Ligand binder design. Structure first.
Ligand SMILES: Nc1ncnc2c1ncn2[C@@H]1O[C@H](CSCC[C@H](N)C(=O)O)[C@@H](O)[C@H]1O
Lengths: 262, 265
């Protein structure tokens, strides 16, 4: 009579923690969602094979509207697991489901997994220097989101790095690329004109973190806005004031222009 | 010809990823450091038994001064694993080692694992609202550092949450408690008097993140400063104005006073 929120990690089925695996292997029913992020290095089958359980994949509507109709009932009589990409409570509204579980008399436990939020440490930027985070959202119809722009502004002023989660439309197999994010930013720039994001702004791109060879690139928007960073998912970062060791790593590992060394 | 940066996880020997465990098992040499942090929910022996290989422990001096002598050599002609708590490279300094590797013609790869940086999401606080992070350090001798205080002020001023790492003597295995951290911040409030941390400030304590039964508590400093949060490690969080969804979670899951639903939203 327990509900487990278990993370699957960054890239493939092996990014799950051993704790999460051994617990998933012994659950009676296993649910999961694959709309909050993209695990580009695996498939349901490989996940199922590793866990030895048939997994019922839920949609965003299933979760946000009928979680307590689809999952909780079984959770009151069995040991249920809910799987998600990366870490279940990072950049999702899943924490709310724990409130739903409690109100339903069901106990919930959380098993963490590698998250993009801390994986960005592989870019060499100091994790403690990241300020507020934001999401670059696809424009829909006449609605054109722009708040992420101000977030970068506020952080840069304080000399802090800005982490930008990129949009996703899982039902349409759409995963926003770093390129699309920059394009959208340049457009917000020409509208608000704040000297926040331009052709000369330094950005860091991290693609498919969790794989053995992720794409880690650093340079000026003018040089990267057209570069191919590989298949999604992608994460875009607008660094603030760089420490020497940070820029060095960016040069040695992310192939950044040495003109940032001064 | 390869060097593996493998993260060990949050608490115990099972917090490493399947990927990290299988790769470590296939490595010829396995190293480990426990001076950036410890793994309070387990032991070197338990980690060794799970990996099935001997683990040679490296000290700060071993790594920061002789990594090129002790590890890199073996990596040039073998598959070598370097194990560390949390997520590799989250610790400010380790990234530098990936540079040494490249120059020594040695491939290096990073195998990720959970970090408290993302694990704090279990507190119900939106990860995007976290601002600059800081470490609360013990005053010693004539030195009395107060920069973390300033970090809280700047983040809270912008409605952002502040993640505070608590001081740790890994070598001596000594943990600063959340209780002590609260006492220190109160003294800094007395010196700074900026109205950043007082008996009325709402804080969140997260202890033993990673274990199945962590301690998550939310409350006002006046009511938690003498509460027993259990065994270390302790992480202290000073949140900014709460989203109602956050306040609801802190009340229903972290036993926070209903009062936050109106006072801190
Ligand atoms: N492995 C990865 N590599 C690069 N970016 C990733 C990634 N995983 C997630 N992202 C970024 O994060 C966005 C989804 S938000 C969900 C993040 C997930 N809960 C976690 O903890 O990691 C993706 O659209 C992308 O912008």
């Amino acid at each position: 009579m327990v509900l487990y929120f278990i993370g699957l990690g960054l890239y493939d089925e092996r990014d799950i923690t051993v704790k999460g695996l051994e617990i998933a292997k012994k659950c009676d029913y296993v649910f999961a969602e694959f709309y909050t992020s993209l695990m580009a290095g695996t498939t349901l089958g490989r996940i199922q094979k590793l866990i030895g359980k048939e997994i019922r994949v839920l949609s965003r509507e299933d979760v946000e509207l009928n979680f307590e109709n689809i999952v909780m009932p079984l959770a009151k009589e069995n040991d249920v697991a809910f799987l998600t990409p990366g870490d279940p409570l990072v950049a999702t509204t899943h924490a709310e489901l724990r409130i739903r579980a409690k109100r339903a008399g069901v106990e919930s436990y959380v098993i963490h997994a590698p998250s993009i939020y801390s994986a960005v440490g592989i870019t060499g930027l100091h994790i403690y220097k990241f300020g507020k985070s934001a999401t670059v959202a696809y424009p829909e119809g006449n609605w054109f989101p722009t708040s992420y722009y101000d977030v970068i502004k506020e952080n840069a002023e304080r000399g802090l790095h800005t982490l930008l989660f990129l949009d996703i439309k899982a039902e349409k197999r759409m995963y926003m690329t770093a390129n699309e994010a920059m394009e959208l930013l340049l457009k917000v720039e020409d509208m608000k004109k704040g000297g926040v994001f331009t052709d000369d702004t330094l950005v860091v791109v991290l693609a498919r973190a969790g794989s053995l060879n992720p794409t880690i690139r650093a340079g000026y928007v003018k040089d990267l806005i057209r570069e191919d960073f590989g298949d999604p998912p992608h994460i875009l970062i607008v660094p603030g004031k760089l420490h020497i060791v940070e820029a060095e790593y960016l040069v040695e590992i992310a192939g950044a222009p040495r003109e940032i060394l001064r």
